[PDB]
Amino acid sequence: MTKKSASSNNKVVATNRKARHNYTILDTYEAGIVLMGTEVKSLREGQASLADAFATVDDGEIWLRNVHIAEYHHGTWTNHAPRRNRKLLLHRKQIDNLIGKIRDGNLTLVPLSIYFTDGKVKVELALARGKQAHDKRQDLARRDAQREVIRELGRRAKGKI
RNA sequence: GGGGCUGAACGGUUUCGACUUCGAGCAUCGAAUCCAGGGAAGCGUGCCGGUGCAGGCAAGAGACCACCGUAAGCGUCGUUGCAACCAAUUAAGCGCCGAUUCCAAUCAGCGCGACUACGCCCUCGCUGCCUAAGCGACGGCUGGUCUGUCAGACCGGGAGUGCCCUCGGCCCGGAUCCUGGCAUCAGCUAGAGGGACCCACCCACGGGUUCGGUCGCGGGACCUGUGGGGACAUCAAACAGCGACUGGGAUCGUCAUCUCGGCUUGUUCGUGUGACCGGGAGAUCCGAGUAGAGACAUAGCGAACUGCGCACGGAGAAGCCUCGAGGACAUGCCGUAGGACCCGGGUUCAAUUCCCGGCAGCUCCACCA
RNA sequence: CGCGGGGUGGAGCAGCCUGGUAGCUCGUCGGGCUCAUAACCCGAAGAUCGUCGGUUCAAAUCCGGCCCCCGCAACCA
C-alpha cells in the first residue's frame, strides 16, 4: 500500500511514534506544511524530531508552532529560524469544521506521518484526545504515569523505530 | 592561499486542495438601497432668519461677531468626553509544607476525693428524705407582729332567682365555715383574682326619604325612647329608596309647543338669509298621556391671494405628487487561477540540474619566498 | 607593521554589499496562580548604534583617523 494501488512513490521518511502513544484513533485529516528549499534536503536522510508540538488557531488559518528541525550535515549552517510560523495549507471546507471542535473539549492537533513525495512533502494531521478524561489530579495520577508509559515504550519497538 | 567531485541532479517533479491578482455574490461595507440644475394652491413666499470648529467626529450655548437694497466661518465662561481600554489558555500537581472545639478539668501517670444556681422564685422554727435539702426553706404537725376568702351597683323586672353586702399596708374584721372530730391554709411577704352589668305597664311622642305621605288600609291602632330616689321622634300590606285607594293639610310637585341658542368649509370675504330654522339628552303658554317606559341634521351661487400696505421673484428646511435603476462608486469574502527548485539571472511551464555564478563547510594543487 | 572580520538595552545574537520610523531570546520592573519560592503567563519601561570628524534633504548604514578585540602573516643566507 504505497499510494492508491500503484500510482506514485511515497514510503520514505518514517512516522513519529509520539502521536500513536499519547493519543487515540478517531479523526484523521491531511494537510501540507509550507516549507522552503533548504528544509527539503534536511528531511531526506531520516532526521526527524520527537519534541512537543501544538497548533494555534488564528482567525481562519492554522499555525502549527513549536517544531524542531535538524538541519545539520558535517559543518555549521546559518539556518533561518527553525521555530518560525509555518502556515499549513488546507481547505476552508475542513478548517471551519475543526475550529469549532478544537475549542470544545480541550483538543489538540498533532501530526501523524510525514509523507515525502517527489521532492514535496505532506503532513498528516489528526484530531484526538489524551488517555485520561480531562484533569482530576487525585483520580488521574496512577494511570497516566504507569499504563501510558508501557504503551509508549512497548509500541515503539514493535514498529521498527 | 586558489580550481571545485557535493548542498532536491534523463526536464514531462500544477499535494483534489492555502494566500494573492481574475470570473461571480454585495450577505457587513461613513445609508429608515439614492435624489433633483422638478411641479401644483386664479404666478410664489415672508412680518424675521443661518453656519461651525482651536481639537480629521459630537453636546450643555451666549440669541459672540457683520451684510453694496441682492444670500458667507466664535472659540465668552463653568462640566467639555472621546486623549477614560485590570487585553485567556492545552493533555506533565501524589515533588516542598499544615493547627481543631460547651457541663468539671487544661503537661502526663498513679494513690485519695470532689464544686456553686437544676428539686430553691420567697425572712425565721420541728420530721421523712430526693445521689446525701450536712436531722431545719416543697409535699405537712405546731409556734407569731405579716389580715388568703361566697365582690360593688346608672336590677328602674313577673317565671326558678333580692345574681351578692369589700378594696392599694385594713376606709373597718374572724364573730355563723379549711386545728382534729368534719368536704379548701407556705399565699413565710409574687398563687396576678375578674371586673361600671343582661330593664314586671304603657307616661307620652312621632306619622317622616318608594308615579310624594299619612288619618279607616294586615297594626287587638302600632313601634320605641322613657317612667317605679327622676324622663321624649315613627311600619315599610309579599317587583325596583323611581311599589298603593274615592276625600281633608304640609313649602304645590313633574312631562312637552314659539322670541333666549349653537354654526358659516384650503387662508381673507363683497352680497344676503336673520334676531330666521333646530319636534337638540334647552326654559316658558295650554292640553294630553299616567308620570321623567322618551328621538331626524342652515346652505348655495363667486370677489381677493401685495398683481389693491412695506419687499423679494429658488428668501433660509409648513406637506404630497412627477423626471431619474446616481455609479455596485464606497469595499474583501467565496468555487480557484497560481506553487519557492540552498538565497540570485536566461528559462520550448517550475531550471545549483542542459547555461551565466555568489557564500559556509569538506576533497584536489606547478616549491624554499 | 600588512590583510580580513567584529563592536547593537544587563549579556549573547538580527539588521551593517540595497543610507526613508533599529527587532528576537534571556534578564529586570509591575500585575496573577501557590501558604510561599521557583517554573508557567502578561503589561510596561530601558540601547540616538565605541568615541571623535566629513559628504547627503536625511548617516547605526557611505568614507577617513584614533583607541580595543579576533583570525591570518610575521618568515630563505
Author numbering: 1 to 161
The publication says:
The 70S-log cryo-EM dataset resulted in one major class of 70S ribosome (with P-tRNA, 99.4% particles) resolved to 3.4 Å (the P/P state) and one minor class of trans-translating 70S ribosome with the presence of a tmRNA-SmpB (0.6% particles) resolved to 12.5 Å. We believe that use of a bigger dataset of about 391,000 particles with a careful 3D classification allowed us to identify this state. Docking of the known tmRNA bound 70S models of Ec and Tth in our map enabled us to identify that our trans-translation state represents the resumed state with tRNA bound at A-site and tmRNA-SmpB complex at P-site. Ms tmRNA is 369 nt long and shares 50.7% sequence identity with Tth (349 nt) and 51.5% with Ec (363 nt). The TLD is formed by the 5′ and 3′ ends of tmRNA and together with the small protein B (SmpB) mimic the tRNA structure. SmpB is a conserved protein in prokaryotes and an essential component of trans-translation.
With a conserved core structure of ribosome, mycobacterial ribosome exhibits various unique extensions in its rRNAs and r-proteins.
